């Protein structure tokens, strides 16, 4: 009412678990466009002589204060809730394959924040370190690929053209094939 609205948030990610068509930043307008619309209500008596310092604004100070209090930490979620399983697939891959579809500034900040990890990782000097692919013992470097209906088509890795779904298969070397595991790919090598 005054922000009980995330009960509505709950459905946006429903298909979007491991069969994601696409995401929406949506539904956010009046849950946003009221919030400091109603600051004007919050400021109506903010340091006002309307009652000259008595009880009568403390019970609604709580309205003034709770109103924020819920807005923030839900609005933590709107990225944090969105940072979580995106970090997870962004663990499943680095920025080898970002999202199939100021969050980019926070992602770039998170990518710069992850640098610390990368510095010690692999060596003192640092390696974006393989954590999520090639438990392969490495074999000969130039043999092709197979998938299980991947989608997004971000394979930018050193190949002729792969067309990243099942039968994304061309003469693709090891440098190419270093992308993904469990987003519709690894029935096969």
């Amino acid at each position: 009412m005054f922000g009980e609205k995330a009960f509505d948030l709950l459905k946006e990610l429903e298909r979007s678990s491991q069969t994601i068509p696409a995401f929406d930043d949506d539904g956010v307008r009046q849950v946003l466009e009221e919030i400091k619309a109603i600051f004007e209500e919050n400021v109506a008596q903010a340091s006002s002589y309307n009652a000259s310092g008595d009880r009568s604004l403390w019970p609604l100070l709580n309205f003034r204060h709770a109103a924020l209090q819920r807005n923030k930490r839900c609005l933590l979620a709107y990225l944090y809730e969105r940072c979580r399983r995106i970090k997870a697939l962004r663990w499943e891959f680095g920025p080898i394959i970002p999202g199939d579809i100021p969050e980019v500034t926070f992602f770039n900040n998170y990518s710069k924040s992850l640098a610390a990890y990368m510095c010690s990782a692999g060596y003192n000097q640092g390696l974006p370190i393989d954590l999520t692919n090639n438990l392969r013992p490495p074999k000969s470097l130039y043999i092709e690929v197979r998938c299980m209906e991947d989608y997004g088509k971000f394979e930018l890795d050193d190949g002729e053209v792969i067309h990243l779904k099942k039968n994304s298969q061309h003469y693709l070397p090891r440098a190419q094939v270093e992308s993904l595991v469990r987003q519709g790919i690894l029935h096969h090598i």
Binding site: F2, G3, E4, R55, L60, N62, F63, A66, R70, R73
Partner: protein, 167 residues
């Protein structure tokens, strides 16, 4: 700013009608206006908690009071009837009302009433051991909190299932 929940304003929004030690003044969202800024001590005086969450029970503003499920007639014999008593989904804020409120009332009797319900878990979830079958058999007699670890209760065993073998 709490031990959070997704419903963090379905936290202190349950309503009770505890009486007034005092007269009234302009509840705002009510029929208050240029109509009434004063009533009696004691009235159907509705209390969605968040405004009175730290508003000095000790101070003469409002009264010792209970919602009658939280009164002894349920609770004090729900600790006697702590055997196959049901909670359903009926008043879900019932592990957690008393984690806040029941002291705030200031009748210095009711906190102990609670746990001896939840003391039963040390001899309840002997039955809770395992998962036979489907995802929906009897999954509707929960609180807002026990369900989570109950799912988790399944969960470690569900993947303890794969600890065994290829299964």
């Amino acid at each position: 700013p709490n031990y959070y929940s997704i419903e963090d304003i379905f936290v202190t929004q349950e309503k009770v009608e505890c009486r007034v030690n005092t007269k009234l003044q302009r509840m705002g969202f009510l029929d208050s206006g240029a109509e009434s800024d004063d009533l009696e001590p004691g009235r159907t005086v509705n209390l969605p908690l968040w405004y009175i969450k730290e508003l000095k029970v000790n101070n003469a503003y409002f009264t010792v009071a209970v919602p009658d499920i939280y009164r002894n007639v349920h609770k004090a014999v729900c600790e006697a009837e702590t055997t196959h008593i049901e909670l359903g989904r009926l008043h879900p804020y019932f592990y957690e009302f008393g984690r806040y409120l029941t002291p705030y009332d200031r009748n210095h009797v009711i906190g102990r009433i609670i746990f001896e319900t939840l003391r039963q878990r040390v001899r309840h979830l002997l039955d809770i051991s395992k998962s036979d079958g489907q995802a929906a058999k009897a999954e509707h007699r929960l609180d807002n909190i026990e369900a989570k670890l109950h799912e988790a209760g399944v969960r470690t065993n569900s993947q303890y299932i794969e600890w065994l073998q290829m299964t």
